[PDB]
Design a protein around this ligand. Structure first.
Ligand SMILES: [Mg+2]
Ligand SMILES: [Zn+2]
Ligand SMILES: [Zn+2]
Ligand SMILES: [Zn+2]
Lengths: 65, 263, 33, 56, 84, 56, 134, 46
RNA sequence: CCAGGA
């Protein structure tokens, strides 16, 4: 839930890259592997951060108060 | 020029590729260690929460705020609060950040590292600015709010090192390799048929001479020449990760010389 | 006609309110879809 | 069987065990909190008097 | 009934249990401010004091060794061989 | 369980940080312990006599 | 990492690897006794009974409830309650001795009987430590 | 100023005292919350 | 009792 700032393994900021990744997929139709790489996420530790994220926050927002 | 030598291969805001020749592996490593652990940085350390109507916990958010990179260029002219003479914090030892956010929009309202505002006097020094590398210029996404979702908090950023917390880590991964042809026999290659065919050739193989099979094993041979890549997070510029790393290790050694002196 | 006690209902059964509820209805009801 | 052959006892402590290549065969790593709870009744004697007064 | 010293037949050597109990007992007594029968060469731990007393056979204790019938042989710590 | 005299042995204390009882790896076998989530019991003697029993 | 133990990247742990939230809801109600002899949800003092918990009552408000935000830490009284006898006996609910955390949600509701009903949720973050299983 | 208790659903503040009636003003629902302390809580960002 | 841990 909610994109991790910084990759656990090396600590490369990954907090900014979320919307940008989600955009390179809808708007650019691009496959996951290219979008990640476009965003400069080269090490698999960094790749796994975005590639395997589950943004549960968006469901959480669906409840009123 | 003199002793150990550098030969930069590539540069950017975020990366330094170089070759370190005429050095002890022990030295190359000790520098590598320091860059990761002992270079000081500014990072949020106390978070006073006035209001939080969010789907996230006070401390969940608090944790993230520490991982947000802050401008630590002039970190050297800021004091560690521990060493400072006040009661808790002050200007001489901290940067005060403020964050007020509210879901005015019917649509989801986002909270970014850009939404942070400095409230403390900076003494005109390059410090505490949330690092924005983001194309759209937003920086780190801290939170998401809906309607009456308010987030009102205060951050106290302090000077620190990665040994205390990894948030004060100015460097991302540091690449480090030597002897791309295993001339030193420092590894026994695991294989099934051929270690040469099975194991991928390094980039750096091009920057060294292949061993040529019709030669005896060089036992006398020692490890010098290190192919490294230093990646910055933002707090300090790539070059200064290297320089400050060299300097920290130098200062660290000086302390020992000085300790002996007092003894 | 005559009240013969109270029967515990199973969640999502015909007699339960949630059976006919949409995703959006459940979120309003504070129930997880 | 339950109150006489076996008994619940004071000066007992229990926690998760973990290994250590740096402990000597015959020693046992005791968590500070556990050490701070468990006690030994030592008699005040010329030999220990000063030490004991300090721990007090 | 008590077996005469000239008719004693148990080991001339001190048992592990005997030695552990003598050391325990002396250490306990030493710790209860009993008089110490040896030069404490800086010693402060009553067990290390006990060990020292037993090392020089200056422990004034006797082992009453009971036999299954009820009789017994008394043995001095001074006279028991400490091969342990 | 304690189906052995070796399932209860006397160790030297070593006060350490962190919430686990640390043991030397070679002493694993007599206890029949591993570190997959095993817990262990500690009993403290209260007399000079009792201590001797353990140590000796 | 011998005999089923493992080594964790303390650096990664700081970055949020394996951190978890933990919540716990303490509950209580006001018991009515035939002739309208109810219990009371309040912050009690000495006042004859003296048979009250040894933990800080001071974290409680007039309704015998801690406000959601307050850091509870040991045996600090989380719920204040009293019952008289033919007077303030103490019916207070302290934080589970072992535990500590922050008051999350306090719920003040009605019972089927129309009686005072309370549920206190306390939140903490559990960061991966040594004997922690994976 | 001052909101002793809040409503669970409609989220309208209530501010009631002892023996006032455990219910909300407009909606029925006897649920009701507590509203955060005014004694601001500080956390280490680690 | 019920659920679980070695
Ligand atoms: Mg096991
Ligand atoms: Zn990474
Ligand atoms: Zn200061
Ligand atoms: Zn309402």
């Amino acid at each position: 839930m909610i994109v991790p700032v910084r990759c656990f393994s090396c600590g490369k900021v990954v907090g900014d890259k979320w919307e940008s990744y989600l955009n390179l997929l809808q708007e650019d139709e691009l496959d996951e592997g290219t979008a990640l790489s476009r965003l400069g996420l080269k090490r698999y530790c960094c790749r796994r951060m975005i590639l395997t994220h589950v943004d549960l926050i968006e469901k959480f927002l669906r409840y009123n108060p | 020029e003199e002793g150990p030598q550098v030969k930069i291969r590539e540069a950017s805001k975020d990366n330094v590729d170089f070759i370190l020749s005429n050095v002890d592996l022990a030295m190359a490593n000790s520098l590598r260690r320091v860059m990761i652990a002992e270079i000081p940085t500014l990072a949020i350390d106390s978070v006073e929460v006035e209001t939080n109507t969010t789907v996230l916990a006070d401390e969940f958010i608090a944790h993230r705020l520490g991982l947000i990179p802050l401008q630590s260029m002039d970190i050297e002219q800021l004091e560690y609060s521990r060493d400072c003479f006040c009661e808790d914090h002050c200007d001489k030892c901290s940067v005060v950040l403020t964050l007020q956010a509210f879901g005015e929009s019917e649509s989801t309202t986002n909270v970014y590292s850009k939404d942070l505002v400095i409230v403390s006097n900076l003494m005109g020094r390059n410090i505490g600015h949330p690092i924005i590398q983001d194309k759209e210029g937003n920086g780190v996404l801290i939170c998401k709010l809906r309607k009456g979702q308010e987030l009102k908090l205060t951050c106290v950023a302090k000077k620190g090192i990665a040994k205390e917390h990894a948030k004060w880590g100015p460097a991302a991964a540091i690449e480090f390799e030597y002897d791309p042809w295993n001339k030193l026999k420092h590894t026994d290659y695991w294989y099934e048929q051929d270690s040469a065919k099975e194991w991928p050739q390094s980039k750096n193989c091009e920057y060294e001479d292949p061993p040529n099979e019709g030669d005896p094993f060089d036992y006398k041979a020692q490890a010098d020449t290190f192919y490294m890549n230093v990646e910055s997070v933002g707090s300090i510029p790539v070059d200064q990760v290297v320089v400050r790393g060299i300097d920290t290790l130098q200062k660290k050694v000086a302390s020992i010389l000085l300790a002996l002196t007092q003894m | 006609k005559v009240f013969i006690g109270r029967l515990p209902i199973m969640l999502r059964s015909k007699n339960c309110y949630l059976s006919e509820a949409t995703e959006s209805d459940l979120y309003k009801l504070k129930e997880c879809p | 069987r339950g109150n006489l052959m076996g008994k619940r006892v004071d000066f007992s402590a229990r926690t998760v065990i973990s290994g250590d290549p740096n402990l000597e065969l015959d020693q046992v790593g005791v968590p500070k909190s556990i050490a701070k709870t468990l006690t030994y009744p030592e008699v005040v004697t010329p030999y220990n008097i000063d030490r004991l007064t300090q721990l007090v | 009934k008590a077996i005469p010293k000239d008719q004693r037949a148990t080991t001339p050597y001190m048992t592990k249990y005997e030695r552990a109990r003598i050391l325990g007992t002396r250490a306990l007594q030493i710790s209860m401010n009993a008089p110490v029968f040896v030069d404490l060469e800086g010693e402060t731990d009553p067990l290390r004091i006990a060990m020292k007393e037993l090392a020089e056979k200056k422990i004034p204790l006797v082992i009453r060794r009971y036999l299954p019938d009820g009789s017994f042989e008394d043995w001095s710590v001074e006279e028991l061989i400490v091969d342990l | 369980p304690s189906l052995h005299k070796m399932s209860m042995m006397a160790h030297r204390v070593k006060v350490i940080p962190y919430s686990t009882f640390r043991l030397n790896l070679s002493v694993t076998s007599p206890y029949n312990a591993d570190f997959d989530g095993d817990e262990m019991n500690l009993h403290v003697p209260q007399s000079e006599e009792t201590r001797a029993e353990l140590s000796q | 990492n011998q005999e089923d133990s493992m080594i964790m990247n303390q650096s990664s742990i700081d970055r949020g690897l394996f951190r978890s939230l933990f919540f716990r809801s303490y509950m209580d109600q006001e018991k009515k006794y035939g002739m309208s002899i109810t219990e009371t949800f309040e912050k009690p003092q000495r006042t004859n009974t003296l048979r009250m918990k040894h933990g800080t009552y001071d974290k409680l408000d007039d309704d015998g409830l801690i406000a959601p935000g307050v850091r509870v830490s040991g045996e600090d009284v989380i719920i204040g309650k009293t019952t008289p006898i033919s007077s303030k006996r103490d019916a207070s609910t302290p934080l589970r001795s072992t535990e500590n955390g922050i008051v999350d949600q306090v719920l003040v509701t009605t019972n089927q009987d129309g009686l005072k009903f309370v549920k206190v949720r306390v939140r903490t973050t559990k960061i991966p430590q040594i004997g922690d299983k994976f | 100023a001052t909101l002793k208790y809040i409503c669970a659903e409609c989220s309208s503040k209530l501010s009631l005292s002892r023996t006032d009636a455990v219910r909300c003003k407009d909606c029925g629902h006897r649920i009701l919350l507590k509203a955060r302390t005014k004694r601001l809580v500080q956390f280490e960002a680690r």
